[PDB]
Design a protein around this ligand. Structure first.
Ligand SMILES: COc1c(C)cc(/C(=C\CCCc2nnc(C)o2)c2cc(C)c3oc(=O)n(C)c3c2)cc1C(=O)SC
Lengths: 555, 416
């Protein structure tokens, strides 16, 4: 019969600050009757206790009557006490992901919400939860009260509640390896793969173990139906999915009309293959006010239409099985978009997703795939505790040629080539040594800082030359225009000498798509060529050719 | 039976708060190894569980040293360290032994376990908080706290500095010329002997430290060699092509920022005029005289280049290809205090990130031996890639600071 206590957790207010000193709000006659009634039973139970005039601390108190519901409930306002309490280790950061669960033959739910108050508070802190109950017509002193348990709405109540619930369950979960118990607020989820008879048997051992500390649970009835709804998901005995994602059939799409459809499509994207949100996010990436009817690009209409074909036929994801291997497949969608499906068995996806390129000036496919892969590796470690084996759209030879020559250290975990629709590849490859028999083009460009007038040209070893005038340009643009002129007038194999550190940087990164049409034109030219050798020489010193063109492009 | 009856008073830096660094995801095998390790440290009372009133947190993970395949627990105390009162012992901080880098042979010893025999200051134990993560946020994280001196902390070596001194007198009084230095959980022993009588002399210091109440069986052997700063050389050919001279002028034009006396006028003259890149250009009288004068300037040392203890060290690393890497250490641009070329080794020649990570570790070690402190690195890899793999190949008990360079250096070869 003797129940053992629940160790108290020493608490403290922020260093240098004091307790709260807020005034009480003048309540109406009816309300006061409610509060007095409430505070009466609560004092009986143990929840609170009356205090003398010593306690200088006071916290506002209200009472609200839930519309179309009998009786009321007090609501203490700890807004101020919270801003003066220390910090706690919030272990309530993020929840599990369905796809990481493993099916169970039986699964029960216990409601431990009733034990949120059976958890004592720190003695030397109770004096901070003081509050006053104004009396009728204020012709008497209001009744004072202080808490002896975890207040509903205090900063560290959840934190203290969870830590204590754990310590108690610890011994049990240790001596019952055949059962699993997830803890999350007012609900305890227990499950196990065994006889439906023996399951409800061990459930009682739990209910009874919780008894040894006093904690009691409301056990009776049966809330069974596969349509388990939890944190936005829809769990079933052996599959899951997102709650019905309804695509607003509206005509006038304001800011929140799309922005609330962005966060909503991203949610659905963890299981429906193909969702796209690029053309949509690019419509409110920089808009004014919270809402505003903004016209949708023609591109944000053809994908949103492919959303109603993907979001047409409900799709379901399975559950994780430790024994089978874990595979990951990636696909290239375009405009810097990629999709991935993770699974163990063909067509039985555990989950799915997308990757968006990082906003940059230049970029290439291989760099993006790596980024997408590192992102899937980290997500899998989080959900399954291990790195999946990859199936990618890139030949083994293409990868080796790349890593061995990239100026950076790079790496991809174990993987295999999959011959699907498109194929990531290298568009062009620069030589390491000059080409014998190829014409040599000495290029140069330059602009006037004020007039914005520049020239871009070149001279070769065969006597060919050219200089073109430009208006409204910088030095950087002129140096690129010059590389381009050479690439257009040269044959299949060519040697190019420049003094532009700026140009060399753009090209040694080996981009295959860019924001600047000038860089894109260069790419197109590099692709048609068979061998291009790009060499650099210091500026404003006698290198010649670069020194001769440099003169023609100046003044 | 070594255990101080008292503890040394420790506090954080004037007006600074404890660490609150987030713990990153770990693989399921690493989780099981940390659970086993921590289950035993708790019984040995080295650590203890803590409640939620503790908001402080420091990262933590699992590696494996050189020999032993058994898991080891490494705690990242970087944040805690810079916030920790730079211990200013009343007896000063051992003036770094400038004799360590001149010694022909140095050996590194892991006397980490000697720290766990000394209690930590009660009012600080809450700053060493760390969590053992759980897969899929299924269960709440196991939380702990250190009771002894934590390996990886910048204070553990200093606090233990007093006991360490006398544990070494019966050896330091015997062998005068031997130089001993300490950093973190490492002990560095240099000498001028030979591998025969150097390797055995270490076994002597091993049993000796074993009789004073003390992974206590590892050691790494290294030899600080020639050229603190490698010279810069110019090709020596008999026939030059326009391309060859074009790269020469580029290299000299770069060296000149280092050595002001270099001249490239007479060499640029051969270049005036648009000529094919693979054509041979005869050197002129003046050309060869200048190439001769420049070659001499490069033989001599750089202008007065000194080390400033107040400022911090920078470390650049270039990827040369085929398992080769180059590097330089410095405080001021164009005033290297050290340059080198870490070559191929166990990188399987297929893993770029494993090599880089071994290079970083190797350059750090050397750095501790010359100036007694680690350098700030500028790694040639995307931040994302590095943060995803580094830990799978790390083996040192300390961790340096680092940043990422995203612009391809124009000099990927003048350092070759
Ligand atoms: C059996 O597969 C499961 C299914 C299908 C559903 C759930 C439920 C929530 C999942 C979130 C809790 C969690 N996180 N990690 C873990 C671990 O569990 C859930 C939810 C509600 C509202 C329920 O109302 C009910 O009456 N039941 C029975 C409910 C069950 C758990 C599992 C398990 O495997 S756990 C034992």
């Amino acid at each position: 019969v003797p129940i053992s206590p629940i160790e108290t957790v020493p608490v403290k207010l922020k260093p240098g600050m004091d307790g709260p000193k807020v005034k009480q709000w003048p309540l109406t006659e009816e309300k006061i009757k409610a509060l007095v009634e409430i505070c009466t039973e609560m004092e009986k139970e143990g929840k609170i206790s009356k205090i003398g005039p010593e306690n200088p601390y006071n916290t506002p108190v209200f009472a609200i009557k839930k519309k179309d519901s009998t009786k009321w409930r007090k609501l203490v306002d700890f807004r101020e006490l919270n801003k003066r309490t220390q910090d706690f280790w919030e272990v309530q950061l993020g929840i599990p992901h369905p796809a990481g669960l493993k099916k169970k033959k039986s699964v029960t739910v216990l409601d431990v919400g009733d034990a949120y108050f059976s958890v004592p508070l720190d003695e030397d802190f109770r004096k901070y939860t003081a509050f006053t109950i104004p009396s009728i017509n204020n012709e008497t002193p209001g009744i004072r009260y202080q808490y002896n348990v975890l207040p509903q709405g205090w900063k560290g109540s959840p934190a203290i509640f969870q830590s204590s619930m754990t310590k108690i369950l610890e011994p049990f979960a240790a001596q019952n390896p055949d059962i699993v118990i997830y803890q999350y607020m007012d609900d305890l989820y227990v499950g196990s793969d065994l006889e439906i008879g023996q399951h409800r048997t061990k459930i009682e051992e739990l209910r009874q173990h919780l008894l040894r500390w006093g904690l009691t649970t409301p056990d009776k009835k049966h809330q069974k139906e596969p349509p388990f709804l939890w944190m936005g998901y829809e769990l079933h005995p052996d599959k899951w999915t997102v709650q019905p994602i309804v695509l607003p059939e509206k005509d006038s799409w304001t800011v929140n009309d799309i922005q609330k459809l962005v966060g909503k499509l991203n949610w659905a994207s963890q299981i429906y293959p193909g969702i796209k949100v690029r053309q949509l996010s690019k419509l409110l990436r920089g808009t004014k006010a919270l809402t505003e009817v903004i016209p949708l690009t023609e591109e944000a209409e053809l994908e949103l239409a492919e959303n109603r074909e993907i979001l047409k036929e409900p799709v379901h994801g399975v559950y994780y099985d430790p024994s089978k291997d874990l595979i990951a497949e990636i696909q290239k969608q375009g405009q810097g978009q990629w999709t991935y499906q993770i699974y163990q068995e063909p067509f039985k996806n555990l989950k799915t997703g997308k990757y968006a390129r990082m906003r940059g000036a230049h970029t290439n496919d291989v760099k993006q795939l790596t980024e997408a892969v590192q992102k899937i590796t980290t997500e899998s470690i989080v959900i399954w505790g291990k790195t999946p084996k990859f199936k990618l759209p890139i030949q083994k030879e293409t990868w080796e040629t790349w890593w061995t020559e990239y100026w950076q250290a790079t790496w991809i975990p174990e993987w295999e080539f999959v011959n699907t629709p498109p194929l990531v590849k290298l568009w062009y490859q620069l030589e390491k040594e000059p080409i014998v028999g190829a014409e040599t083009f000495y290029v140069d460009g330059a602009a006037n800082r004020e007039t914005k007038l520049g020239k871009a040209g070149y001279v070769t070893n065969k006597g060919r030359q050219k200089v073109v005038p430009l208006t409204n340009t910088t030095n950087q643009k002129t140096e690129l225009q010059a590389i381009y002129l050479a690439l257009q007038d040269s044959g299949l194999e060519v040697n190019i000498v420049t003094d532009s550190q700026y140009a060399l940087g753009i090209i040694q990164a080996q981009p295959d798509k860019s924001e600047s049409e000038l860089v894109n034109q260069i790419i197109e030219q590099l692709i048609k060529k068979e061998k291009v050798y790009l060499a650099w020489v210091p500026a404003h010193k006698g290198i010649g050719g670069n020194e001769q063109v440099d003169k023609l492009v100046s003044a | 039976p070594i255990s101080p009856i008292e503890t040394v008073p420790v506090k954080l830096k004037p007006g600074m708060d404890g660490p609150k660094v987030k713990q990153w995801p770990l693989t399921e095998e690493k989780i099981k190894a940390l659970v086993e390790i921590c289950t035993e440290m708790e019984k040995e009372g080295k650590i203890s569980k803590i409640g939620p009133e503790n908001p402080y947190n420091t990262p933590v993970f699992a590696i494996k040293k050189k020999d032993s395949t058994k898991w080891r627990k490494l705690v990242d105390f970087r944040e805690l360290n810079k916030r920790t009162q730079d211990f200013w012992e009343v007896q000063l901080g051992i003036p770094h032994p400038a004799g360590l880098k001149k010694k022909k042979s140095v050996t590194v010893l892991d006397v980490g376990d000697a720290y766990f025999s000394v209690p930590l200051d009660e009012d600080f134990r809450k700053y060493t908080a760390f969590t053992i993560p759980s897969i899929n946020n299924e269960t709440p994280g196991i939380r702990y706290q250190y009771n002894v001196l934590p390996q990886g902390w910048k204070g553990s070596p200093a606090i233990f500095q007093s006991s360490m001194t006398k544990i070494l007198e019966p050896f330091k009084k015997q062998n005068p010329d031997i130089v001993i230095y300490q950093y973190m959980d490492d002990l560095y022993v240099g000498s001028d002997l030979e591998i025969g009588q150097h390797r055995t002399k270490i076994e002597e210091l091993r049993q000796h430290l074993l009789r004073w109440g003390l992974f206590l069986w590892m050691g790494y052997e290294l030899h600080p060699d020639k050229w603190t700063v490698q010279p810069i050389v110019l090709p020596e050919k008999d026939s030059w092509t326009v391309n060859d001279i074009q790269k020469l002028v580029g290299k000299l034009n770069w060296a000149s920022q280092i050595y002001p006396g270099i001249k490239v006028r007479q060499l640029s003259k051969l270049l005036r005029g648009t000529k094919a890149l693979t054509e041979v250009i005869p050197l002129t009288e003046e050309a060869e005289l200048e190439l001769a004068e420049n070659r001499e300037i490069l033989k001599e040392p750089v202008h007065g280049v000194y080390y400033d203890p107040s400022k911090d060290l920078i470390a650049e690393i270039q990827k040369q290809g085929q398992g080769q890497w180059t590097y330089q250490i410095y405080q001021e641009p164009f005033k290297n205090l050290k340059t080198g070329k870490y070559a191929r080794m166990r990188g399987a020649h297929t893993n770029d990130v494993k090599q880089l990570t071994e290079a970083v570790q190797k350059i750090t070690t050397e750095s501790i031996v010359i100036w007694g402190k680690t350098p700030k690195f500028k790694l040639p890899i995307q931040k994302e890639t590095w943060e995803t793999w580094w830990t799978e190949y790390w083996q040192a008990t300390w961790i340096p600071e680092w940043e990422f360079v995203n612009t391809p250096p124009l000099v990927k070869l003048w350092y070759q």
